[PDB]
Amino acid sequence: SGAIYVGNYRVVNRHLATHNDWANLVWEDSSRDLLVSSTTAQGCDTIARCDCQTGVYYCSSRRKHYPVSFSKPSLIFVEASEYYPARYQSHLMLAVGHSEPGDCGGILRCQHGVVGIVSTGGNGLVGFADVRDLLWLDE
Ligand SMILES: CSc1ccccc1OC(=O)N1CCC[C@H](C(N)=O)C1
Ligand SMILES: [Zn+2]
Numbered sequence: 001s002g003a004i005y006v007g008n009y010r011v012v013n014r015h016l017a018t019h020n021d022w023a024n025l026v027w028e029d030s031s032r033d034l035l036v037s038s039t040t041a042q043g044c045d046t047i048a049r050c051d052c053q054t055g056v057y058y059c060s061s062r063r064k065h066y067p068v069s070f071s072k073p074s075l076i077f078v079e080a081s082e083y084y085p086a087r088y089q090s091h092l093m094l095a096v097g098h099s100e101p102g103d104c105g106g107i108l109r110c111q112h113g114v115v116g117i118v119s120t121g122g123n124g125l126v127g128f129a130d131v132r133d134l135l136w137l138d139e
Contacts, residue, residue, distance in 0.1 A: 002105025005043030
């Protein structure tokens with residue numbers, strides 16, 4: 001679980017969005033596993049606008065943060081799950097690091113701010129949904 005709170009927006013994994021997120025929907029993209037909903041309170045986070053390929057992510061299944069080197073956002077095949085059929089997920093960045101399904105929503109940050117959230121993983125890999133291209137999050 002986990003979200004990014006920026007301005008009057010909440011960014012969550014689309015597969016974990018709640019009834020309230022869908023009732024206050026701003027934008028969603030199943031191909032990216034992202035959903036953004038509106039909030040009444042001003043958010044705590046800031047978004048990186050950079051090309052960093054290293055950073056630190058939070059891993060809830062270890063209660064720890066880990067440093068990672070990750071690939072640039074790209075189209076990657078993701079096997080079927082209870083949430084989606086087998087498909088290509090876009091704007092996904094892979095890295096070597098521990099993750100389990102419940103880790104989705106953990107933030108990845110570089111020295112410039114929030115880069116993205118955990119969205120996929122497996123066998124010593126962890127994948128992050130990039131948010132750096134969503135310029136409208138802090139217009
Ligand atoms: C950190 S997720 C994870 C980690 C290890 C093993 C499996 C994991 O589950 C995934 O890769 N899934 C399940 C939830 C939806 C994901 C998606 N974005 O399509 C794909
Ligand atoms: Zn950066």
